[PDB]
Amino acid sequence: EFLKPRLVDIEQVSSTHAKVTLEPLERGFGHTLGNALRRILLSSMPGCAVTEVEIDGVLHEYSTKEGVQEDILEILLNLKGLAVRVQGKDEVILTLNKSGIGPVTAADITHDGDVEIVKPQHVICHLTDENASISMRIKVQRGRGYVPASTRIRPIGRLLVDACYSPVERIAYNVEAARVEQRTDLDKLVIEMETNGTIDPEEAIRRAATILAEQLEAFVDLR
Amino acid sequence: SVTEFLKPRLVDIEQVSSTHAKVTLEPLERGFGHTLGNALRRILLSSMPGCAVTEVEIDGVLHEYSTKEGVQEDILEILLNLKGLAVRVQGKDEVILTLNKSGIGPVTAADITHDGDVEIVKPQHVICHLTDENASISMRIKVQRGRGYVPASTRGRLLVDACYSPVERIAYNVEAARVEQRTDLDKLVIEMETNGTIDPEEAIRRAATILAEQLEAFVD
Amino acid sequence: EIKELLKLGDLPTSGQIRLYDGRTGEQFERPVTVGYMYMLKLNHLVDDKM
Amino acid sequence: KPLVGTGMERAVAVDSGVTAVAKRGGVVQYVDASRIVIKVNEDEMYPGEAGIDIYNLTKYTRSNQNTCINQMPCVSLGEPVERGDVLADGPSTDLGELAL
Amino acid sequence: ILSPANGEPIIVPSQDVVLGLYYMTRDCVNAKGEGMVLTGPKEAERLYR
């Protein structure tokens, strides 16, 4: 009796910005699905985030390293913003080695076959001495939600980084009139998503729908 | 483990009355209580299919603000009473029920002429009252199958607001819930009252089924 | 002048926009003043006082 | 920085002494999170000197109220600096502007 | 819940609770749904939601 919506278009506006169109939708279902998917996408999408950093010669974040423009704490903050997609494993160790003057960016991270750097120009720090060199081991873990380091339960020098696993940055949704073959009371839902570039928009939409359906299984057979 | 979420372990269904239920589900992921409650509330309010009174033809009355001798209630109050008539039309989508009554007494739902494929949920529902011995009332009620609530303002053919959805009231609340350590969890309390064609539990199940079938094109 | 600067940024001159409830998606019935305020964390933390 | 200010933020930040202020104009010869080395301009040199100004930055020291006093440079390698320019921001300062 | 000084209630709503009740109990001349006849408060809540 109800017409079932289908994914009809995916407009990849940019690498981190996409639009997904669901069509057709009956009255009221556009806003219902829009809000449910918005909440699930903002709260429950999985992603890979930096959780641990080991910089050679560094004991804690409240310190400086010779030849480095940024404080160790600022380096950790920059690594917190590093967007990485990991394939086939939930935890990886990346190696960053850089020498000489210049910005040390995500492109200088040692290449890993199962790891993709979505934004290679992400600045990690700046080396300002020709003889200065930085070497770090960065732990990247898969998770969901927000997991602070203080609520996370180690040799000295292993610095914990707060993990914002969610790849989704912004979600908006608009319900507008849809042009059907014979119907006029059908809407379409356009979900505009801005991410960190580490999750496919269609994968995110299907993921949110699966989460919603599994949460609805309890109500489907109430007892 | 990133693809597994907490499922309601405790589901308590308190039957306040035959048509009134309180369903408590616990525990839920943070924010999932509002998501599920709002989605189910919207579906129950605006999307639940059902049968309801849509028109009435009353002999002697030509328009809503009219009178009829021998009837205690006003025509507007008769329309209000017809709005509350819960009818199960199993056979068809459109049905016409004839109501022919005479003599002093309460004209109730049980006095409507019987139809094979039509069921009266509450036969003692009062349609109107006749205060005269020779007072008579002849009406034809058009009951249709639709979705949600359709006001007569959006549509002598007297128009009655169509309460297709069997939902009389639906509300939800989110309370703090907790497991061994996690204390930020959601507990969803759904207070629901139906019009008696279907009980609250079945209505909640139907709303959940409709929402789940809406997602069939994206569920892995 | 503030309204002129708001026009320059293609923002409403009243400083009020349409907000939606995140819990339900329902539009709030009236326009809500939304902008940027410069906020300070004072040295009165609950950690030191509890 | 405050998006809406009064214009007094720079005076407060500079006069407080929490920031590193270039004593003489020149070019940033060296810079890191703890130190700034300015190659002074020829016209601002006393006769018998190299023309090198060294600014050692205060790093993660407690204040009288157990808050953090930390100076971080706001200039880059090779940048030209004038006398009175902020070389390193202090606590609650952003590019020489008071940022509470 | 009563003041010992004068016997008046102390738990009277204030500020935003008063604002919410006032806003929801205000009337508008040409508001949507005007002139409708409702079976009761439940129908009013259903129509508003």
**Residue B171: phi, psi to the nearest 5?**
-140, 155
Whose CA is closest to B137, among B200, B75, B179? Answer: B75
CB-CB neighbors (< 8 A) of A35 in chain C? 24-25
Type and span of the H or E element at A80: helix A72-80
Are the beta carbons of D33 and A70 separated by less than 8 Å?
A: yes
Hey, CA dihedral for B80, B84, B89, B92, is it positive or negative?
A: positive
In eight-state DSSP terms, residue D18 is -
Chain C: residue whose CA lies nearest to B33 = C23
Are the beta carbons of C36 and D65 separated by less than 8 Å?
A: no
Percent helix, strand, coil in chain E, to 5, is: 35, 5, 60
Task: Write b or e for each residue in D42-73: b if 16 or more Cβ atoms lie within 10 A of its Cβ, otherwise e.
Answer: eeeeeeeeeeebebebebeeeeeeeeeebbbb
Between CA B34 and CA B175 the distance in angstroms is 10
In eight-state DSSP terms, residue A111 is P
The minimum CA-CA distance between C17 and chain B, rounded to whole Å, is: 24
The letter for the amino acid at A109 is I
Cα C4 to the chain's mean position, in Å?
A: 19
Chain C: residue whose CA lies nearest to D1 = C38
Chain A: residue whose CA lies nearest to B11 = A223
In eight-state DSSP terms, residue A3 is P
Nearest to A128 among D32, D70, D72 (CB): D32
Cα A182 to the chain's mean position, in Å?
A: 41
Contact flag for B and A (3+ C-beta pairs < 8 Å): yes
D60 touches chain A (CB under 8 A): yes
CB-CB neighbors (< 8 A) of C24 in chain B? 34, 38
Chain C adjacent subunits, 3+ CB pairs under 8 A = A, B, D
Contacts of D5 (CB under 8 A, 6+ apart): D97
Whether omega for the bond prior to residue A24 falls within 30 degrees of 0, making it cis, is yes
Chain D adjacent subunits, 3+ CB pairs under 8 A = A, C
CB-CB neighbors (< 8 A) of C25 in chain B? 38
Contacts of B200 (CB under 8 A, 6+ apart): B19, B20, B21, B23, B192, B193, B194
Tokens 């009809």 — which residue? A8
Enter the tokens of residue B60.
Answer: 């002697």
B173 touches chain C (CB under 8 A): no
Whose CA is closest to B79, among B89, B93, B66, B69? Answer: B66
Between CA B98 and CA B134 the distance in angstroms is 19
Rounded to the nearest 10 degrees, the angle between the axes of helix B32-46 and helix A201-220 is: 70
Which positions 3-22 of C are in contact with A (Cβ < 8 Å)?
22
Q: Max Cα separation, chain E?
A: 47
**Residue E15: phi, psi to the nearest 5?**
55, -125
Between CA D61 and CA D68 the distance in angstroms is 6
Rounded to the nearest 10 degrees, the angle between the axes of helix B200-214 and helix A29-44 is: 80
Between CA A133 and CA A97 the distance in angstroms is 8
Between CA B49 and CA B109 the distance in angstroms is 22
Confirm if B143 and B89 have CB atoms less than 8 A apart: yes
Confirm if B95 and B89 have CB atoms less than 8 A apart: yes
Chain B: residue whose CA lies nearest to A215 = B7
DSSP symbols for chain B: -TT------EEEEEEEETTEEEEEEEEE-TTHHHHHHHHHHHHHHHT-EEEEEEEEEETT--SSS---TTBSS-HHHHHHHHHT--EEE-S-SEEEEEEEEESSEEEEGGGBPP-TTEEES-TT-EEEEE-STT-EEEEEEEEEEEESEE-GGG---EE--EE-S-EEEEEEEEEEE--SS---EEEEEEEEEE-SSS-HHHHHHHHHHHHHHHTTTT--
Confirm if A71 and A64 have CB atoms less than 8 A apart: yes
Confirm if B137 and B107 have CB atoms less than 8 A apart: yes
Nearest to A71 among D31, D33, D76 (CB): D33
Contacts of E10 (CB under 8 A, 6+ apart): E1, E2, E3
CATH number at residue B144: 2.170.120.12
Enter the tokens of residue D23.
Answer: 């004593």
Confirm if B21 and B13 have CB atoms less than 8 A apart: yes
CATH of D18-92, one of 2.60.120.260, 2.102.10.10, 2.40.50.100, 1.10.150.650: 2.40.50.100
Show the domain range for B96. Answer: 49-163
Between CA D41 and CA D24 the distance in angstroms is 8
Strands of B94-102's sheet, edge to edge? B94-102, B136-147, B49-58, B158-159
Between CA B45 and CA B23 the distance in angstroms is 17
Tokens 């326009």 — which residue? C31
C35 touches chain D (CB under 8 A): no
Whose CA is closest to C14, among C27, C3, C1, C28? Answer: C3
Contacts of B43 (CB under 8 A, 6+ apart): A28, A29, A32, B207, B210, B211
The letter for the amino acid at D52 is I
Between CA B81 and CA B111 the distance in angstroms is 14
Chain A: residue whose CA lies nearest to B3 = A46
In eight-state DSSP terms, residue A56 is T
- Technique of determination: cryo-EM
Per the rule left: phi > 0, alpha: psi between -120 and 50, beta: everything else, D7 is left
Whose CA is closest to D74, among D4, D20, D18? Answer: D20
Confirm if A33 and A22 have CB atoms less than 8 A apart: yes
Whether omega for the bond prior to residue B27 falls within 30 degrees of 0, making it cis, is yes
Between CA B163 and CA E39 the distance in angstroms is 11
Chain D: residue whose CA lies nearest to C36 = D3
E45 touches chain B (CB under 8 A): yes
Confirm if A174 and A41 have CB atoms less than 8 A apart: no
The letter for the amino acid at E29 is V
D29 touches chain A (CB under 8 A): no
DSSP symbols for C1-31: -HHHHHHHTT--TTSEE--B-TTT-PBPSS-
Whose CA is closest to A72, among A165, A157, A147? Answer: A157
B38 touches chain C (CB under 8 A): yes
Contacts of E15 (CB under 8 A, 6+ apart): none
